[PDB]
Amino acid sequence: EAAAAARDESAYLKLQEQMRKIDADAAALSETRTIEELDTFKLDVADFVTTVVQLAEELEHRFGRNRRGRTEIYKIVKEVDRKLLDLTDAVLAKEKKGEDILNMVAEIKALLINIYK
Numbered sequence: 001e002a003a004a005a006a007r008d009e010s011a012y013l014k015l016q017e018q019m020r021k022i023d024a025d026a027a028a029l030s031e032t033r034t035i036e037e038l039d040t041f042k043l044d045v046a047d048f049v050t051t052v053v054q055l056a057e058e059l060e061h062r063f064g065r066n067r068r069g070r071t072e073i074y075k076i077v078k079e080v081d082r083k084l085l086d087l088t089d090a091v092l093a094k095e096k097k098g099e100d101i102l103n104m105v106a107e108i109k110a111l112l113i114n115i116y117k
Contacts, residue, residue, distance in 0.1 A: 022112070025037070034091075038091055052073075053077065056115075073115060076114060077115075
């Protein structure tokens with residue numbers, strides 16, 4: 001059997017894989033203007049955020065190694081929500097282009113990175 005990594009590390013690795021899907025979705029969001037794809041994207045991020053936030057909660061409770069306090073983590077989450085909400089408005093907007101869609105997503109990624117580490 002292949003060697004296993006610590007629970008904290010094992011969760012970290014898979015989170016990286018989740019990002020790729022978001023990155024792939026970002027390309028699709030640029031490729032297509034349908035909101036239906038966005039509906040899943042907004043929810044998908046919540047799963048990523050919940051896992052990271054929950055993971056952060058466990059770090060304090062279990063191992064006792066948390067890089068930052070809960071308050072700082074929450075601040076980041078609120079900013080993420082606005083970006084997805086703003087993007088939804090753009091999709092509804094009468095006018096829109098591929099670059100506008102991607103630009104909004106590109107900054108969503110940044111918010112997810114600093115919580116990942």
